[PDB]
Amino acid sequence: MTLNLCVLTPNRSIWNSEVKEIILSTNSGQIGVLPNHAPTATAVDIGILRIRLNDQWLTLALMGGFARIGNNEITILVNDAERGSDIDPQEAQQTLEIAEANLRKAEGKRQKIEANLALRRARTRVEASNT
Amino acid sequence: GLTALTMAEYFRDVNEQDVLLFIDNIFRFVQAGSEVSALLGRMPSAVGYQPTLSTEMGSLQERITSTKEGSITSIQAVYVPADDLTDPAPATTFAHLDATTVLSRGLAAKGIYPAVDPLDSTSTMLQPRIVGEEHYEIAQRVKETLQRYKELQDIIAILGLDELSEEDRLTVARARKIERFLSQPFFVAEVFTGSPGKYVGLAETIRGFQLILSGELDSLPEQAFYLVGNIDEATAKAMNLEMESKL
Amino acid sequence: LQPRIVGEEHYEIAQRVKETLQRYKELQDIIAILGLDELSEEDRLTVARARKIERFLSQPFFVAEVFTGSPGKYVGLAETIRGFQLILSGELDSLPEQAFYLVGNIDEATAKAMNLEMESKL
Amino acid sequence: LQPRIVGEEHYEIAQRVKETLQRYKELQDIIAILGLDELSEEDRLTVARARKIERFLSQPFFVAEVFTGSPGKYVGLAETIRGFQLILSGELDSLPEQAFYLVGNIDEATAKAMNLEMES
Amino acid sequence: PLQTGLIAIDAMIPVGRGQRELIIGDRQTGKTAVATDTILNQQGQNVICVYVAIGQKASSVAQVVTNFQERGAMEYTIVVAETADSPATLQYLAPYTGAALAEYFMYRERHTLIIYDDLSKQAQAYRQMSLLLRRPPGREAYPGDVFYLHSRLLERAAKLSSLLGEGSMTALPIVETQAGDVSAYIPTNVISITDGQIFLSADLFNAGIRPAINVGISVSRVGSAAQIKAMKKVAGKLKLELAQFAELEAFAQFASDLDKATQNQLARGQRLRELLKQPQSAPLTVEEQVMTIYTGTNGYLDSLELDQVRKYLVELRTYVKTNKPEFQEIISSTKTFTEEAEALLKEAIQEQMERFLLQ
Amino acid sequence: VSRVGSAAQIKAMKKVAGKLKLELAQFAELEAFAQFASDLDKATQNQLARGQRLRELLKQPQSAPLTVEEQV
Amino acid sequence: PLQTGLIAIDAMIPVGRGQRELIIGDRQTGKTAVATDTILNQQGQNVICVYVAIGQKASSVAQVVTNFQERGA
Amino acid sequence: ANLRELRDRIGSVKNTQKITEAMKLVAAAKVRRAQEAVVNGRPFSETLVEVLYNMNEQLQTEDVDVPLTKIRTVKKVALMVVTGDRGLCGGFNNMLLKKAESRIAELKKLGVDYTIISIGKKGNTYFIRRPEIPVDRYFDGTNLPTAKEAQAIADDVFSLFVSEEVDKVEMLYTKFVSLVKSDPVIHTLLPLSPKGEICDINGKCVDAAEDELFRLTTKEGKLTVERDMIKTETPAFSPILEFEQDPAQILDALLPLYLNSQILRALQESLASELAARMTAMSNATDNANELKKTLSINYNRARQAKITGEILEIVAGANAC
Ligand SMILES: Nc1ncnc2c1ncn2[C@@H]1O[C@H](COP(=O)(O)OP(=O)(O)OP(=O)(O)O)[C@@H](O)[C@H]1O
Ligand SMILES: Nc1ncnc2c1ncn2[C@@H]1O[C@H](COP(=O)(O)OP(=O)(O)OP(=O)(O)O)[C@@H](O)[C@H]1O
């Protein structure tokens, strides 16, 4: 009843199943794709991608990437995607405390970017572990 | 053994028959000779055998021959002590053997009676000058096909027949059918297997194997060759296995 | 060494020690050429515990303090059962192998482990 | 073979040759089953040096010119000592093993190595 | 069939009445143990048993005979004892008097069993007297008629001819190898003479598997004719699966990175090995071992842990023998593994699995 | 081996070289087993180093002896 | 030279008249085919050949003698 | 006790042969699984490279100026090396580390300020025991190389680059091209062409002969590999994609996917090549242990016959002396 959706991580096809309404965490801001969308190619940010199974609104946990919209056949190329919820948030807070700790420790200009990416990914890890 | 050899030599010499002298374990003949020499007090030979080992053996093996009248052919069971072929009982037994048939527990278990190993069996007769160039080359091609199958069993175990090359897959199928065609129903094993038993001469043998080895009998199942003789019976069993499918 | 003569605890600990030593003896050539690092997770624990058992079987004799250069020790049966049960229980996995060499009982093994750690640190 | 009879230089060179040959003989069965790829760097260097030594041990004979060809060589003691000092000292470490096989006087080993590399 | 009570024997190396089976092994591997378990398992059957103790220590014979009297196997047993202080003549004659007694009982229409414990001691006694009579020796100083000594004795073990009385005498000689030399003189003699051989391994004995039967090298030339019809069915699957396990055993350290079928066959074999273990002087009845082989070979114990297979099987055998005697009766009277017996066994397996997962 | 043992030694040599043969045999077995070990502990490396220093010390030129105090 | 007719022998193991050359191998690896080749090769040369069969089976001697007779040696 | 220790030595050689053929077969299974992993990770990078080629053609007139395509010609250099995780490797890690020595010997000459990122276990052990080399990070094969190892490597090298500390991040790995031979290659990674084509150490577009999707097939009775050129690639077409993001920021959010995909592809190739070297080494070791077992059995039969002979001769000598 909706446009086809596929998430592709570098090694495996995650799932080739379609879901009704999808909100895309982009570099310009959260946009939602409506069925029979005109093809728009959007860049993706490290954030929260959520789906609509037409039965229950559910979230996807991705570590970044780039998504293309096709004629009801869209592709989502990511860096690392976790379908649905797989980890519980408790280990995620036990990891965010070390994340904010090692930010304080590592302050080199390259380690600046390492810890900033660690923060940007740990945050979306938690906010996708919310459900 | 000399008693049996005398009874066989009568049938050869007087009646001009072709006699088949079956010896039981010829190791126990040598062992009984070593016993009687250790009893008579003679000084033993190398690994403990009687000093008259080669001559004791020759006095038996030199009357299993072919005269102008008939021919005694002997089929002697051979036990190898300590499983080494260099012990003086096998070392002197094998100086008088012309051919060798090894019976394999593998083929006996997987139902391919007679369980003769095709590759570990030898014969000094299998030479072009003796058996004809055609017979020699078809026997060599069958041995090559079976050896390739035995080398490829592990590769097909890992990958599969769909992942081999085309010539290797054709080889694997041909070797499967050949392994199943070496089997035969016996007139003696008929009483419990039920199959009426077949006698297959050498001409029909090489003519059936030539066809199964060239690309003529490739469109047949494997179990169409199993437990038949005389490749026409294999095509008849094939037609029955195809009647089971058209029905 | 029959259960009805010797007690089930003694019989079972003797059987387990013998099985660990036999498994280590059978793993010997897969170690001695192919590498102790590539070993599985269960065989590494077997090798470690069997070396500890091999060291712990040794004992200083009172009559052999001229050879061992150390005082001899008498070890009762219950302390032997308890020491080997500790070793192949998995709770003495932290002591060095040489902490089990030529010791009377398992408290001497732990004392020698402590002394070795002290020598290694300062 | 005593430092008081043959001198200390001869004695030490013979001792070092026998030591590397003994190390090679030790790891022979391991390198027979597994191969050289598993040895350490020092053990591989010892293997290569022991192979060069056991090739430089062979020699053409005047009485065996019919079997080998390449007529026999007489090698004094000083030349043998200098050649084995050169092998074990690591100088002649980048030339083929076959340069040492059936020659005398390691300057001939170097001549043979140059001839082999120029002939390819 | 001659039931020995050892499941690994009766399924893999079956012994029949009138057959000479060799108990050959190294020292302290369990030869006397196998012999005693067979004599104790002859309790229900009307088999007269004979144990010939040749050159043994007198306290060993004392322990064996008191064990017999304890377990009640002394009412149908005779013990011929020639300890190691006896003259060589008595230790050489003792197996022949054992054979004479068993021959009396055999020709009076009774089925007998004779165990010659350490026939090697009889061979050494005969060698001693042969050397002292100044006779020419052979290999290992044995007289040239030591094979005649052993064969003239072992050929007495017969299965009579239905006009002589249908009696029989099963012979279980025991031969001790030294340093694993199966090619030694007296072991080769008895291996040539006897019907089959049953090899015991010290490596298997140390590894825990007792009785330490090396089935891959043990033979029985009588074959499945020494089995009941209920045992051949389950023994076929036991043989096939143990053979496949023996093939894949070198792959057990690489089990994780293998096919699922290969991992399944490896686990199946490694928990079929657990039901071949068996405590000393505890022989199983033929119905108990039939049910054990059935469960193990079908895979109604492919879920438990290896430290639990033996305990589960003990509880299961007790459960069946107490709750469903119809299975015992079906296997005992009809001597075949009937589909009704299969139904009773599957019901008992389900119920015992529930009761065992109740802990 | 020596069946008489440390009783054939002065008290100085008993004091310094009493437990040495058994520890040298244990080092020999340890060094044998560490040939096919990839990663090593620091205590194991130190024991190996001590064993090799002792093995270098054990050497003697022929007809060039040490006294008891030099040995100590 | 004492030519055997076999290329490998005559090229790499050359044998002269007056030399004791041993033929050593396993069973059924040759050595009698080789011996008979050397004897059948002496047709033009002025060389007497002696062949001693010391323990062979009588059928092997029969084959050798009939091959000799047929080929003219 | 000499015959028994001979029998035990023969038994240990039999055990060695059995375990080496087991290792050979399980290494063949793992080669097949690594090939499956490569062919499953293929289509992701296929769609990625076609998308990126089209987008760069839509961006050549633009001002893309992403740090990844940018060229910093002051030329510091960051060589990275992947090596075998486990051991015995045939001669895998030796050749890999040796070509690393060759590259650093060429580099430290030119003053290009080389440095090393080691990924394998044998590699990083070699590098810590040879401390004369600068090193940037350590990684291991305990963690799976399929996802998380390569993602961590991509993170480390991305943060190494975008903090513009070094140029010329190039990689040394060993492409599985053949069973018996696998020659390492040096491909540049980060100073990548805007088209999206992997280059060589100099950069002369060696993506032309990459020969994707190696597969294992026998030749006559022995397993080989077969490597063809082009499979299931549709790069030509590009419709109106109607971008929502910025045209340069599109490439900025895309190119890390190329980095991760290339690193993962190299890890999978070097893993398959290490397992193939292990398979051929264990085949050779099985054959050598086979001939050793044969020689041992011959020597043992000879010793047994000699022992029996000497024993009986001694017995009969004593008897005749009496
Ligand atoms: N099935 C078994 N389970 C547990 N223990 C066993 C078993 N079989 C034998 N043993 C143990 O093995 C030991 C030696 O067994 P046994 O004496 O039967 O072997 P043996 O070979 O006859 O000995 P010997 O070599 O002295 O004649 C005994 O202590 C016995 O308890
Ligand atoms: N050059 C050859 N070409 C073809 N066939 C050969 C050749 N040499 C030997 N044969 C065949 O090999 C078999 C064995 O050869 P040969 O008779 O020379 O060995 P042998 O001396 O009989 O060995 P043994 O005497 O130990 O049995 C013979 O049947 C012969 O036909």
**Phi, psi values for residue H48, rounded to 5°:** -65, -45
Domain boundaries, chain C: 1-122
Say how far apart CA A10 and CA A65 lie, in whole Å: 10
Structural contact between residues F43 and C96, judged by C-beta atoms closer than 8 angstroms: yes
Distance H1 CA to ligand 1 centre (A): 25
Q: Residue E341: count other Cβ atoms within 10 Å of its Cβ.
A: 23
Closest among E223, E198, E196 to E20, alpha carbons compared: E196
Q: Residue E158: count other Cβ atoms within 10 Å of its Cβ.
A: 18
Structural contact between residues H99 and H123, judged by C-beta atoms closer than 8 angstroms: no
**Buried (b) or exposed (e) across H132-145, using 16+ Cβ within 10 A?**
ebeebeebebeeeb
Structural contact between residues D88 and D81, judged by C-beta atoms closer than 8 angstroms: no
Last residue of a domain, one of E208, E227, E246: E227
Ligand 1 and E211: CB distance under 6 A: yes
Closest among C21, C22, C26, C28 to C87, alpha carbons compared: C21
Structural contact between residues H184 and H173, judged by C-beta atoms closer than 8 angstroms: yes
Q: How many domains does chain E have?
A: 2
Closest among C122, C91, E202, C120 to C110, alpha carbons compared: C91
DSSP per residue, H174-223: -----SS----EEEE-SS--TT-----SS-S-GGGG-----EEEESSSSE
Give nearest CA residue, ligand 2 atom 27. Answer: G28
Ligand 2 and B122: CB distance under 6 A: no
Closest among C4, C19, C16 to E281, alpha carbons compared: C4
Q: Where would I find the H helices in chain A?
A: 89-105, 109-129
Burial of E322 (0-12, 13-18, 19+ CB in 10 A): exposed
Element (H, E) at A6: strand A4-8
| Structural domain for E83, as ranges | 1-227
CB-based contact, H285 to chain D, within 8 Å: yes
Question: What distances in angstroms separate CA B121 from CA B81, B98, B153, B180, one per listed residue?
Answer: 19, 11, 20, 17
- According to DSSP, residue A37 is labeled -
Closest among B96, B93, B73, B150 to B119, alpha carbons compared: B150
Half-sphere exposure of H268 (CA within 13 A, CB side): 26
Say how far apart CA B159 and CA H224 lie, in whole Å: 12
Burial of D119 (0-12, 13-18, 19+ CB in 10 A): exposed
DSSP per residue, C56-89: HH----STTTTTSSS------HHHHHHHHHHHTT
Burial of D51 (0-12, 13-18, 19+ CB in 10 A): middle
Q: Experimental technique used?
A: cryo-EM
Burial of G55 (0-12, 13-18, 19+ CB in 10 A): exposed
Element (H, E) at B168: helix B166-181
CB-based contact, H213 to chain C, within 8 Å: no
> Which residues are registered as beta bridge partners of A23?
A32, A50
Structural contact between residues E234 and E337, judged by C-beta atoms closer than 8 angstroms: yes
Minimum Cα–Cα distance from C33: chain F residue: F36
Structural contact between residues D88 and D16, judged by C-beta atoms closer than 8 angstroms: yes
Question: What distances in angstroms separate CA H18 from CA B104, B151, H172, H316, one per listed residue?
Answer: 21, 16, 35, 43
**E303-307 contacts at long range (C-beta below 8 A, 24 or more positions apart):** E304/E271, E306/E270, E306/E271, E306/E274
Closest among B98, B95, B8, B85 to B53, alpha carbons compared: B95
> Which residues are registered as beta bridge partners of A7?
A15, A76
> Which residues are registered as beta bridge partners of B100?
B122
Q: Residue E231: count other Cβ atoms within 10 Å of its Cβ.
A: 27
Residues E21 and E166 in one domain: yes
Element (H, E) at E171: strand E168-176
Residues E191 and E254 in one domain: no
E221 assigned to active site: yes
Say how far apart CA F17 and CA F48 lie, in whole Å: 19
User: Pairing state of beta strands A81-82 and A73-78?
Assistant: unpaired
Residues E233 and E221 in one domain: no
Beta-carbon contacts of residue E113 (< 8 Å; ≥ 6 apart): E2, E38, E39, E42, E47, E48, E49, E50, E102, E169, E170, E172
DSSP per residue, E289-302: HHHHHHHHHHTTTS
Distance E283 CA to ligand 1 centre (A): 15
> Is E57 among the annotated ligand-binding positions?
no
CB-based contact, D35 to chain H, within 8 Å: yes
Closest among H208, H184, H207, H216 to H34, alpha carbons compared: H216
Q: In the numeric block, which tokens belong to residue E129?
A: 């007297």
Structural contact between residues E17 and E159, judged by C-beta atoms closer than 8 angstroms: yes
Query: Roughly what angle, to the nearest 10 degrees, separates helices E260-272 and E286-298?
Result: 160
CA angle E140–E144–E147, rounded 5-degree value = 95
Q: Which residue has the tokens 């060094």?
A: F31
Residues E56 and E100 in one domain: yes
Closest among A1, A83, A3, A67 to A30, alpha carbons compared: A67
**Phi, psi values for residue C65, rounded to 5°:** -75, -10
Closest among E338, E278, E347, E283 to E316, alpha carbons compared: E347
Which bin fits D105, alpha (ψ -120 to 50), beta or left (φ > 0)?
A: left
Q: Where would I find the H helices in chain E?
A: 7-12, 31-41, 58-71, 88-107, 119-132, 146-154, 185-193, 202-206, 229-248, 260-272, 286-298, 309-323, 325-333, 339-357
- According to DSSP, residue A68 is labeled E
> Which residues are registered as beta bridge partners of A44?
A26, A65
Ligand 2 and G37: CB distance under 6 A: no
Best of E135, E190, E192, E224 to disrupt the B interface (most B CBs within 10 Å) is E192
Burial of D67 (0-12, 13-18, 19+ CB in 10 A): exposed
**Phi, psi values for residue E83, rounded to 5°:** -70, 180
User: Pairing state of beta strands H223-226 and B99-100?
Assistant: unpaired
Closest among B90, B111, B89, B86 to B100, alpha carbons compared: B90
Beta-carbon contacts of residue G68 (< 8 Å; ≥ 6 apart): G36, G39, G40
SS3 D35: coil
Q: In the numeric block, which tokens belong to residue H266?
A: 């190299």
Say how far apart CA C35 and CA A80 lie, in whole Å: 36
CB-based contact, C43 to chain E, within 8 Å: yes
Burial of H246 (0-12, 13-18, 19+ CB in 10 A): middle
Beta-carbon contacts of residue E179 (< 8 Å; ≥ 6 apart): H1, H3, H4, H7
Q: Residue H34: count other Cβ atoms within 10 Å of its Cβ.
A: 24
Q: Residue E82: count other Cβ atoms within 10 Å of its Cβ.
A: 26
Closest among A95, A78, A103, A99 to A129, alpha carbons compared: A95
Burial of C88 (0-12, 13-18, 19+ CB in 10 A): buried
Q: In the numeric block, which tokens belong to residue C49?
A: 């515990």
Q: Which residue has the tokens 């050899």?
A: B5
- According to DSSP, residue H145 is labeled T
Structural contact between residues E285 and E230, judged by C-beta atoms closer than 8 angstroms: no
Which is it for the CA torsion H291, H293, H298, H302, positive or negative?
positive
Residues E249 and E223 in one domain: no
Say how far apart CA B224 and CA G10 lie, in whole Å: 54
Q: Could A9 and H147 be called an inter-chain contact, meaning their C-beta atoms sit closer than 8 Å?
A: yes
Q: In the numeric block, which tokens belong to residue B164?
A: 């081999």
Say how far apart CA A3 and CA A10 lie, in whole Å: 23
Which is it for the CA torsion C10, C11, C14, C19, positive or negative?
negative
CA angle H100–H103–H107, rounded 5-degree value = 135
Residues E79 and E126 in one domain: yes
From chain G, pick out residues whose CB is under 8 angstroms from the CB of B124. Answer: 28
Structural contact between residues H307 and E136, judged by C-beta atoms closer than 8 angstroms: no
Q: Which residue has the tokens 């293997």?
A: D47
Element (H, E) at G11: helix G7-12
